[PDB]
Design a protein around this ligand. Structure first.
Ligand code: GTP
Ligand code: GTP
Ligand code: MG
Ligand code: MG
Lengths: 171, 430, 437, 38
């Protein structure tokens, strides 16, 4: 409602009509649509690609609920095909440093985000008869080959908290 | 643990809540003004379990009237005992929820839960040690179901270790004529099994059949339904309002009547059956009361105890009588009707006696059972739910408010798995 | 000279300790306030009755008890009762939340918050004693608090005072007086926890007391008030050696040496005779041979067992009244020549006779009459194991269906504890059966 | 005295003690320090 008011009374919001016709009182009702469908439509423009992904990576992925974390991971996956360079150069390394944090939920969210980014980059490269290593530089290949090994070095797979790390490593 | 906060959502819940308060006040001698005027010390030995002491030796209730519209909120405040409650304990909106669970659980309810959790923490702050909660709502109405189940979840998320007890009133097509009540009922169950600890099943079809066939009434009204619901509430809580060793607190009652986490639905019963403006001079004996309390006709649910197996049974006899005779009658009933009792939970029938019979009756009897036959109350709901959900009828009301078919699928699955578990436990070691 | 420190926790435990203390002072002549006119030495304490009582420089004879409750209910009765001036405010500990019949909620939740308080009181009281024998703990298997907090206190004492005995007087569950369906689980748990922390524990079958009250005393509905008055008499008769100038079981180690041959087999069988109602007081006086023959009758036994089927390991008797050693010896010889009492092949087969010339005593207005002579026979019989057998019948039928198990899982307690306790009980039953060979 | 009891019971007691000690050791090894309540 605030966005609609700002677009109707000021008309200075970039792509106000588009983000107002797709996101309305009815379409916004669904959370899955807002996190996967409407999200990609709103991020299609260059004025909402960086901040949206930044907020998804520095907040939603580190939520206190597994459902919200999975939703943020799926949103990042869907928004990883509108920004391959930004997802493979500024967000992927950003996640490699957070996968080693002491927090359990943060580690799980970072692992999920890294897996989703890798899957999206592979899907994008498959549509151009090119390998996935082109987008994921040697830096990415190293960290990804160190997620499971480092976790076992800190007996992090033990306990209830270790069960979520085991599931994340399996995924 | 010595103070219990009372809550009531929806019109039926508020009405059922106001009737129970009036009954326990008339039984304790608390006149509408708030001063004690009874004639027994036991009435004051356990008065702090539901009331609060205030200047002038007054007993202020500890309830919280909650609604989304103002009708029921004005009806209770203006009732014969309406002045008893607190003026700042009435929290309601203006539009209602229109028989929609979504509107009452995600919009108006989600907005008024803030103020609701303000009065709730106000009552918990005036409690030396909170013991639990006792909500009174219905599973048919939208506001009564949605926002009330939203208050159970909020309390379970806030207060970590506190017992949760509710008096769910299952609707019935015979009373109401609204089509979206099957959906408003199923979803509620999906919450209770995963939120509430104790829940009493008060089917409306059973009350209608008892009022139309037993009490002889051509047009049973909502005044007759509240006359049977309040008596049941006064009978099932007689142990918490007076001295006792069996179930003095809510934790003990839960531990004794909840053999499994998901299985905690107790069908209540009370005898002798009476109606408004009727005085039975004949005083039934103890054997007659024990035989009538176990009869399916005196059950508040539409389930026959004979077509099932008992798990936990608790009987209470209110009236001047002998304990040896009651014990002998209970032993005889357990021996004769032994096939209707699981043999894998030894000593699963408790009996208690009280020296404070209800008003207008010299001899009363109560029955809180945990038989697997209660599953029948859900199977009926299942048929309606499935029949209405397969063709997609009136579904836009839910999907258009944030909900989706996934929730209905989840609730249907949870309810269906609760029926299978009941059937399995009923045939344990067959 | 040595002095003991008694402890009473729970509703059943404190209610029995109150009657025991009332009966103890009733016999010692100690007035309700605490003044003892019979005591001529002020400030000094070195008599037989000083084992359970201390003395202030005013005269007051304070008990050596520790009344701990997790809820303000039973403690208030004794605090505003008749012997509230007998105990001190510090010795009357009180909590808030109740365990609500749950060993886990009392051992890993609401009991780990007040254990330190009870331990600081058990250290301050012991500091005022030159010599300590052990600890007489009173609890009940039915109450979850008596199974959790009592076990925790026993475990902590085993580490603190690792060289002191710990005699016990547990209370066994009965359906005619019970209010919980989970009393077998907590009972088995506390039994498995205390099997490795006690030396001699006497059981009290509530069914036996109910039958004795309904038959002998002729009571229609025996209540907890009448049961406490009948169990207190036996508790006093058992501890009469630790409070009078006798010659048998004068110390706590004597109990373990004369009634506990196998460390794990420490559940003797107690009996008391006679038990005549107040109406039939001045009617007939039974001789020693009359109260010694009835002791063997299952009707008077404290546990519903059949000692005739099994054998005995140790036996002793404590008299109270004008009893002659020659008459007791003649009665024992007659019973041995008549009854076919069998003993274990590797155990000594003799009766430890100990007469007390003090006459019995009963509380005024009580259902028990002032008999001229009474006797308390303590014999370790294998038949008592049967009392545990039926208990296991209540643990396999329920535990098989996983009934009432979530209450312990959600309270921090693990699930393997039940299996460990069941294995321990099975091993104890196997040992009992092997001893019968 | 313990000498009065035959060795048949002493051996069983020692076996049970060893078994419970091994079980406690296994439970302690399986436990996690970052998840205890005490
Ligand atoms: N026994 C009984 N049932 C009632 C009563 N009032 C309503 N009901 C039943 O409750 C259901 C309707 O719910 P309401 O209580 O009207 O709903 P609400 O909580 O007011 O919710 P909204 O109507 O959506 O604002 C139907 O099944 C009615 O038959 C009452 O006083 N007694
Ligand atoms: N003989 C006897 N038995 C008692 C007495 N009080 C309770 N019991 C029995 O003890 C069992 C329950 O123990 P309680 O003492 O009530 O429980 P508690 O130890 O206070 O435990 P929580 O309230 O659960 O914390 C039941 O079998 C009762 O019948 C009593 O005074 N005497
Ligand atoms: Mg309404
Ligand atoms: Mg208690």
């Amino acid at each position: 409602a605030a966005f609609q008011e700002n677009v109707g009374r000021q008309g200075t919001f970039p792509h106000g009509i588009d983000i107002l016709t797709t996101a309305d009182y009815f379409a916004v009702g669904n959370r899955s649509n807002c996190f996967l469908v409407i999200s990609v439509f709103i991020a299609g423009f260059p004025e909402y690609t960086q901040p949206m992904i930044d907020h998804l990576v520095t907040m939603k992925i580190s939520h206190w609920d597994g459902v919200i974390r999975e939703l943020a991971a799926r949103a990042l996956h869907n928004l990883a095909q509108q920004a391959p360079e930004f997802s493979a150069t500024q967000v992927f390394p950003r996640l490699l440093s957070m996968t080693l944090s002491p927090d359990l939920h943060m580690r799980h969210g970072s692992i999920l985000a890294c897996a989703e980014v890798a899957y999206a980059l592979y899907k994008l490269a498959a549509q151009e008869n090119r390998p996935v290593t082109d987008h994921l530089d040697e830096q990415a290949v190293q960290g990804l080959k160190q997620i499971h090994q480092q976790l076992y070095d800190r007996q992090l797979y033990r306990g209830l908290g270790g069960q979520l790390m085991r599931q994340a490593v399996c995924v | 643990m010595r103070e219990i906060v009372h809550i009531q959502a929806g019109q039926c819940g508020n009405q059922i809540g106001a009737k129970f308060w009036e009954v326990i006040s008339d039984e304790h001698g608390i006149d509408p003004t708030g001063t004690y005027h009874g004639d027994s010390d036991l009435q004051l030995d356990r008065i702090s379990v539901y009331y609060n002491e205030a200047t002038g030796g007054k007993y202020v209730p500890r309830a919280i009237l909650v609604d989304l519209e103002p009708g029921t909120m004005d009806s209770v405040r203006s009732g014969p005992f309406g002045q008893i409650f607190r003026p700042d304990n009435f929290v309601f909106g203006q539009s209602g929820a229109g028989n929609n669970w979504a509107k009452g659980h995600y919009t108006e309810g989600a907005e008024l839960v803030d103020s609701v959790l303000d009065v709730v923490r106000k009552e918990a702050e005036s409690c030396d040690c909170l013991q639990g909660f006792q909500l009174t709502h219905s599973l048919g109405g939208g506001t009564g179901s949605g926002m009330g189940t939203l208050l159970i979840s909020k309390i379970r998320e806030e207060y970590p270790d506190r017992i949760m007890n509710t008096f769910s009133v299952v609707p019935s097509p015979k009373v109401s004529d609204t089509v979206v009540e099957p959906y408003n009922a199923t979803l509620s169950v999906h919450q209770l099994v995963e939120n509430t600890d104790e829940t009493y099943c008060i089917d409306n079809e059973a009350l209608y059949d008892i009022c139309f066939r037993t009490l002889k009434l051509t047009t049973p009204t909502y005044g007759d339904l509240n006359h049977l619901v309040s008596a049941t509430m006064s009978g099932v809580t007689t142990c918490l309002r007076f001295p006792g060793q069996l179930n003095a607190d809510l934790r003990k009652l839960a531990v004794n009547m909840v053999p499994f986490p998901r299985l905690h639905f107790f069908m209540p019963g009370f005898a002798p059956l009476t109606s408004r403006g009727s005085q039975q001079y004949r005083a039934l004996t103890v054997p007659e009361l024990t035989q009538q309390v176990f009869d399916a006709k005196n059950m508040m649910a539409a389930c026959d105890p004979r077509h099932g197996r008992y798990l936990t049974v608790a009987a209470v006899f209110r009236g001047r009588m002998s304990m040896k005779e009651v014990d002998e009658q209970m032993l005889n009933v357990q021996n004769k009707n032994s096939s209707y009792f699981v043999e894998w939970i030894p000593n699963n029938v408790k009996t208690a006696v009280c020296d404070i019979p209800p008003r207008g009756l010299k001899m009363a009897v109560t029955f809180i059972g945990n038989s697997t036959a209660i599953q029948e109350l859900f199977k009926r709901i299942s048929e309606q739910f499935t029949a209405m959900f397969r063709r997609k009828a009136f579904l836009h009301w839910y999907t258009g408010e944030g909900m989706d078919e996934m929730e209905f699928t989840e609730a249907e699955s949870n309810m269906n798995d609760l029926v299978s578990e009941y059937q399995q436990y009923q045939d344990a070691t067959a | 000279m040595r002095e003991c420190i008694s402890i009473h926790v729970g509703q059943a435990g404190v209610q029995i300790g109150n009657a025991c203390w009332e009966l103890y002072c009733l016999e010692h002549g100690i007035q309700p306030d605490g003044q003892m006119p019979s005591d001529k030495t002020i400030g000094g304490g070195d008599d037989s009755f000083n084992t359970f009582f201390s003395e202030t420089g005013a005269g007051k004879h304070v008990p050596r008890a520790v009344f701990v409750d997790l809820e303000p209910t039973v403690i208030d009765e004794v605090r505003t009762g008749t012997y509230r001036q007998l105990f001190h405010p510090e010795q009357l500990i009180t909590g808030k939340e109740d365990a609500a019949n749950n060993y886990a909620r009392g051992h890993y939740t609401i009991g780990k918050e007040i254990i330190d308080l009870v331990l600081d009181r058990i250290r301050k009281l012991a500091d005022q004693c030159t010599g300590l024998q052990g600890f007489l703990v009173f609890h009940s298997f039915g109450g979850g608090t008596g199974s959790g907090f009592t076990s925790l206190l026993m475990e902590r004492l085993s580490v603190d005072y690792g060289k002191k005995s710990k005699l016990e007087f547990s209370i066994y569950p009965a359906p005619q007086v019970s209010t919980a369906v989970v009393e077998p689980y907590n009972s088995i748990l506390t039994t498995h926890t205390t099997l490795e922390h006690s030396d001699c524990a006497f059981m009290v079958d509530n069914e036996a007391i109910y039958d004795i009250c309904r038959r002998n005393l002729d009571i229609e509905r025996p209540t907890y008030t009448n049961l406490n008055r009948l169990i207190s008499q036996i508790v006093s008769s058992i501890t009469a050696s630790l409070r009078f100038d006798g010659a048998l079981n004068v110390d706590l180690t004597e109990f373990q040496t004369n009634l506990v041959p196998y460390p794990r087999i420490h559940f003797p069988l107690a009996t008391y005779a006679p038990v005549i109602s107040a109406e039939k007081a001045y009617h007939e006086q039974l001789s020693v041979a009359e109260i010694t023959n009835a002791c063997f009758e299952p009707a008077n036994q404290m546990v519903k067992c059949d000692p005739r089927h099994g054998k005995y390991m140790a036996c002793c008797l404590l008299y109270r009244g004008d009893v002659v050693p020659k008459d007791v010896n003649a009665a024992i010889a007659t019973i041995k020549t008549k009854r076919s009492i069998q003993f274990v092949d590797w155990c000594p087969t003799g009766f430890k006779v100990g007469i007390n010339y003090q006459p019995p005593t009963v509380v005024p207005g009580g259902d028990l009459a002032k008999v001229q002579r009474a006797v308390c026979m303590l014999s370790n019989t294998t038949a008592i194991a049967e009392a545990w057998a039926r208990l296991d019948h209540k643990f396999d039928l329920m535990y098989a269906k996983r009934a009432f198990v979530h209450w312990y899982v959600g309270e921090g307690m693990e699930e393997g504890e039940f299996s460990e306790a069941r294995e321990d009980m099975a091993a104890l039953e196997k040992d009992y059966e092997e001893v019968g060979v | 005295d313990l000498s009065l009891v035959p060795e048949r019971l002493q051996r069983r007691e020692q076996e049970r003690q060893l078994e419970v000690e091994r079980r406690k050791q296994k439970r302690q090894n399986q436990e996690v320090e970052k998840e205890n309540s005490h």
